[model samples]
Target: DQPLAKDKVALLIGNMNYREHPKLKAPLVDVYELTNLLRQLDFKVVSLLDLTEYEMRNAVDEFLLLLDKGVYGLLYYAGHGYENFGNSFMVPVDAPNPYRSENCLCVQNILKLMQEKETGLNVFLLDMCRTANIVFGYATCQGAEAFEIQHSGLANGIFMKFLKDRLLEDKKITVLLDEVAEDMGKCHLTKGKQALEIRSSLSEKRALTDPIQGTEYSAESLVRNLQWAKAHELPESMCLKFDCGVQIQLGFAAEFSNVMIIYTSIVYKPPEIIMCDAYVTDFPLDLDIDPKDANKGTPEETGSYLVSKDLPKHCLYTRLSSLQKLKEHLVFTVCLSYQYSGLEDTVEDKQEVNVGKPLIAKLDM
Candidate 1:
């Protein structure tokens, strides 16, 4: 529903080779996912595996050239970053002394480049390591799925995944990050003292998918019904929109009780969020993970509606990028977490289904 191709462009760089520092495995591996996801979302992405300060600056300079008015541009860097005398900086390979600070790129400079550039919206996804107070970031303008898992790294790809899904549905730059606020709760642990995760001046809904791919289905099901739908009930998939997000509704049905704590997980394998260990009637899916089901049925919720308005708005489904894959089918796992009537249980219910109804049967009318 937005403009067509080349409306967006991106610069992605992932690195693991530290300069006389502890060997980090995650950045190199994490970067691959971001790169692929960016490409799939129709972003004209320019990526390099590892680079020195010279190379980094050169790429950034070249990248800035693409940031003219009207087009959305972004830069992603995953590696070491720190604060010097209260100023932030991102570390790159070939730095003589990472602790000295001057050897790295100042975070403010990167932000300034995007801010000063005459572009529609410029995003930069900086995937730092466990050292949080020193390094952090989230993409602003635009943004993965992934590749084979040959490298040993535990990368929780929260930013790119949701960005990809929402962009597929034509979500905005700022709203994209808003949707994954809570899903990246675990990241809070990695951000350390400062947790420099959220930063932006964006206030518009920017759709990434343009005229390509013909007609697009629901970008991906953000909501679904768990129980069998009543005659008057809404469909399993429903789209919800706001200045902050295009929150979709997914239907799910499960047993509930006071003694149970739920831990539900929703993911795309390539793009994974996590489970909510704490039990609550409802929590913001944008911020928290799905809750666990004690089982699949509920007690009296009311006369007609069997639940409250304060639960998850959408159901879990694969946010596939292709229409044929969507038509054929996609699989998503919904884990029902709970403390059973007597024992502790975390039963996972994996459901595989198609995106929309197919008109295949011969219509005799």
Candidate 2:
């Protein structure tokens, strides 16, 4: 089988300043491990190690140029992330003030660079929240909250729509081909001096009691109808019951043949109709395009036009709609069951959650 992203390029950035800032240990290890894994998978990775702000910007520009040449790409960064006012930033190797995060990194600028739609995929990973005074330092003084840091600098609808479009095209060509062919075979057959038409036209004036009377059937139409129904149907959650103290976050979106549903909860349980509050984001509209206009610039221009105008904040409340799909690509779902101490009985437990895999969803626009 061919690799999912055989034609893609990747940029892996790992910041290791443990000597100066011991708080940034895990992220450094994460970036290095992820880079190695991608190299093994045959990606042309541009690895950046402990780069300064200038180097970071330069690397992004170079990556953008690769995207312009029709290369699918990914950008991965792991380091210290902080927010000042409403702006978010990532710490660089030569950051001026180690304690003052605002002077060193700009999270929005990095996201802007990767949000282009012509790219196969764009992913942003900020595993930079490791400090003794983590929440207090970044939240209270900087007017940033824990939720803000988690959801800041999100990609919007343009990229999400692009991904959905690609998925639909694939489904139509690969999965629905047989259905289309079957439909074509059911057309009228013409013999010499005779035309045979198989028509099941129902009379409008007659009230037919037959089950199949008012129904229309065609292989192609059936496939299309099924696709539409699946696209519109909501995915049922495995765990549905939660206590009052439990916190829950739910997200759902559909484009073409693909539908994604995400759920995050504080309480973990299984085989129950969970009644947690659903935090749903409005589904983005399909992008309008003119396929006949081949010379109408590039897909980037059209993508930018369809891109959402709202700038996503770095807060849990400010969900990253575009990155949601990318997250699905790089993350794997897992479930675990175990017994906890002090429980009256051994509680049966199961929950669905994502584990960060060492892969990149590079943007190639």
Candidate 3:
């Protein structure tokens, strides 16, 4: 039987102001137009306008619930955002800051919510940037500019240290992290500058675990589990490669979990070529890996046990061919596979299951 192409859902959030904050005007317009565009694209459009913190949280919960039910397409957001210190934040309608400057919203929280296996293609088009100060009592926050200046000379060195720390901590494992690290390392040697920045406003926020201790697990623990699995599973080297001048966005999500990983690779060769292409790889654990393995320990662990050990000659040669053909621009492909494992039932005891046999699971690019 043929597997489904996967399903998708989108959540659009736009927060304009905090109890009539003057600068909150843009987000109102942004969300209205954005939602209309999404509807035009045939999305179900779970739209939220002028959401408070509580409403925002509830909206995210509902979105995740829908994603878990089936394949999810994309999640898009547009609104007013600011960076506090070094962290990126999205302003909410009720931010309790008298100055209005310190109460920026956390975009990371939004991204974290959409990082689920059920989410197929995650595309974030943040139109929020540092422009003239739209609100009073707060000076225009141009820290991004300052950060850029400080990083211009020290970006590579600082990023190297950050990567080393990340590898040591092994907190979370996302394909983007590895890609950014690789790109930074390569740029350090060739370009003598860091090309990527790891910016998050909620980096220092504490986890509120006591409230949902038994009911739900912590994201930190989940990340650790994923990191362990990714460390053991996944191919040593990604099959897709790009050349001198190309831009690519690879959409990735795991069916085993509700998170999606969007990886964008861009190549630039001044005076000649520039290309941008994005690939969305839906990790429908139901389709990407053996169904039996999906319920096992962790998706990474499941992936480790199911990924093909030997690459097919045809796939390898095809990748090489694509690289040769798209040498001047960007090239990418999606990889998929499935494996089998012993199965069982839940507490309901509906029925016990078994594995008939073992077989090799392989995917072609």
Candidate 4:
């Protein structure tokens, strides 16, 4: 077998809300699942959502910094894009009308830079339409359209639905993608409308499941690991004691770089208290939290269906979005209310908690 890759790193950009193009729904779940699966494969992953052109450039630059000799580098982009004169361009959220090369990021150029790093394996998974005149490798036939199936609640891209499940298998990168493409051909909706196309110049047998064998690490490697680790880091789960003799547990989970799910549950309540509940509220203005949507008993109530199984089942889920705009610590109130068995009056306690820039908020640009 070939030597294991020195490291495995991936950069996932899911641009959904394009200012000048149609909005996409699949990228949300697409990026989220891929992030989790890639992490399971021991790949340091940076998953971002709704990035502008400048942000995309900065992100790619950051990704490039992490690449080095014999490393496995992968870039996955899902959003609006077009091909002109045989060149593929990624459309950012803030792209202007009739966007051109100046307003978009060229994948060919990024590929050139990746090659310069002397990487062991270079993989590019683009889950967007080639838009004709098309690597002219797309989720659909060249000069054809790729479709997103909008069924009931969550929409999924044609490519990811099949690709995600096969990713964990210990197969060559091209073989893995080949199986996914074949699976797409068998699906009812994608039978004719959409198909997976893979174009690669790879000659190696490196798989995503390849082990990490590199021992020596440089300062740049340390910086790269820390930078990627900080983005996925969640706040420590802590117990908060209130004046009412109740203990509340606060925890966190990330749905994306810009989306988070915080849950609070009552740890212990006095026997005298007939009814008690702990909920999060009073979010800072910097976050895009919905008052009505926050503090729900079920993750589904907060529009978060893919929460981890390790999360407390009976906790209050508060979904926080647009975390990239957060400028300061995440300060919020964990309100507790209790009522005595025979008492008519209700006692309320509020404790202000400040979790310092939890999760992706810590990643500044």
Candidate 5:
């Protein structure tokens, strides 16, 4: 059977640190979890946290730009918001007190822009206090506020707390949401306080897990695919031959849009070389790379958790972040040092390689 969508993209905004309004605690975790989950379903996700009015507008415009005909587009917001004049608005962090429609971004207006692209599916998951039309899912009913539970070291929205559990199921969009609502209904904490409201015009058997097929790339779709791919491209795994007869394999993994992990392991070593190690170093000045955390034995030691599951073992891990602010191509030195059975001194060799803008660094703002 053919898939339901030709392509899929998502924009997730979580505005927590408000300049004037009360700050939120759940958006950080909610957006982070959803971003990882959506990526697993092969959706190109642009997950951002904390936006002002101006930034929010630009963000939505960027999201709209990614939409194409027969494409599945999903927008999720978890922050302070309200419904006014039958229009649901997403409040930016810098919105004024007693914010009116002018101070907020209209969700319905965004929908209109998405419709212009002839998108196959439009899913709006708003995890806010009050909330929408095309396959719209709200965290709470009208005039009722959504709830968040605070753990000892973490916080999550009541909506995302339950929704994340059921998001990976290969059910139709509406059916998956209905199941989430049913699961949420059984929770004792938010049973009567905040109820999920789902309103949809979607009639197709479309699913988030639908395999993308027959991608008839138009001008916009071609540009969109290129744009989406730029942020996920990793450096080609390379085998570096050193003077000490040791070959080190360098590999890359993206932990997040702004984070990358590099691992180096000795693939080939001389029999006399009893001990050897290769690690990345000499990062550019603009990278903001930390010396203390670099070239660790484990990914956890480098402060990366999400991408460690699939990484190769017995390799030295180097975690790099703040890629959005990096101005130069990623050039680092792979240092190899080995100890021989007879020699007391450690022999060392170095190779400098340039991997241009790995991952999110390729995105031009």
Candidate 6:
């Protein structure tokens, strides 16, 4: 019933224009994801958004006409879907009322059209389950009442997390639906949420197209994180033949978040001229306000004490420990620790400024 050469035709619809509901967020989100997924599977997708009753039927008709003789056809709806006496109804965007029976499209009615005309496998994906309308369902976000969003945005309450996989896999409709129901049933938005309901008559193990992949989720953030420096740039190398205090301005890219912590540890190697008690030193970088141990000033507050007079807000003062050298290579390794996107990470970089040359050798011991 399926082959590589056969065309895959699909119609996807997401409704969020209901006047009486909480406003379906995940439907629009779910539809957009499934549309891209279907296209990756090589299907010819007709994606529609916030369609009215007349427009819904029109889109379905267009999908039927676009379905080639030997191609797989599918219809996916991710909004409010209802059923009465085994007759399934696809709710439109501008339903007169949520309970008005006449304001919805019957799923059984469209199945008849596909059964009569389509020659290849015909599939239907319903991500609008978990509603109070059906026992086989709890319905996803119907409007405001069900429109609760997690930090991950709209996970569609659970069914979509698992069912999105089955659409492109090689499995019978029954088997695929069973697995999704099993995986989703355990999830359910409510404590007594029922497993998803799928009433299908198609008896075939098939897929719209073989699996495909191009995994890239929101790279806008990656581009944003780059403006910040991996390690602070230094003003100059270590002082030679001198036992004076060394102060350097630590600068960061302007695009970094205003509130962040940066700790730097400057380590001195062996063969030191000055017998200092501690080889390493630590400091904190925050642009929000003056920390308990303060040095640098931020834009968020007034009377900022910054080292780099040119760019006060973007600079964090990291004072390098002074070292006396005599015909030896002076190296200061800086180890950095900070929190990046909820991840505790550490990056190390070294600056070997002290040269071991005969011309400029002895300093302080």
lDDT of each: 0.43, 0.36, 0.34, 0.79, 0.79, 0.46
* Candidate 3 C-alpha lDDT tens digits along 136-242: 01112222333343333212222333333332232222333445456556654534433343332222211111011232344643543333233122222232333
**Which has the better TM-score: candidate 3, or candidate 6?**
6
Cα lDDT of candidate 4 equals 0.79
| Model 1 lDDT per residue over 1-365, tens place | 45433345666776566666555554433455555666677665554544667657766776666654555566777666666676766667776753666667777776766666555566666655430011124432111113434432444344444444454555555555665664445456423322336676654444444433343333221111111111112224423222222222344332111011122232222112132221123222321223342222322112112222334432222111111112222223332342223445453332232323111101111
What TM-score does each of the candidates earn? Answer: 0.47, 0.33, 0.32, 0.86, 0.73, 0.49
Highest TM-score scorer: 4
Candidate 6 regions with alpha-carbon error over 4 angstroms: 1-5, 129-152, 186-191, 210-365
Clash pairs of candidate 4?
none
- In candidate 5, list every pair of residues with a backbone clash: none
Candidate 4: list runs displaced more than 4 Å: 17-20, 96-101, 129-137, 140-149, 182-191
Global CA lDDT of candidate 5, please?
0.79
lDDT of 3 at 332: 27
Selected candidate, larger lDDT, 3 vs 4: 4
Q: What is the lDDT of residue 334 in candidate 3?
A: 36
TM-score between candidate 5 and the true structure: 0.73
Please write out the lDDT profile of model 2 over residues 274-320, one tens digit for every residue. Answer: 33223222222221113332112322222222111221222122112
Predicted candidate 6 versus true structure: per-residue lDDT over 194-302, tens digit per residue? 4466655544445455332233233432331221121112223332221222223223221111111222222332342232221123221211123443333342232
Give candidates' CA RMSD values in order. Answer: 19.3, 25.2, 22.6, 4.2, 5.4, 20.1
Q: What does the lDDT read for residue 217 in candidate 5?
A: 58
- Could you tell me the TM-score of candidate 3? 0.32
Better of 2 and 5 by TM-score: 5
Using lDDT as the measure, name the better of candidate 3 and candidate 6. Answer: 6
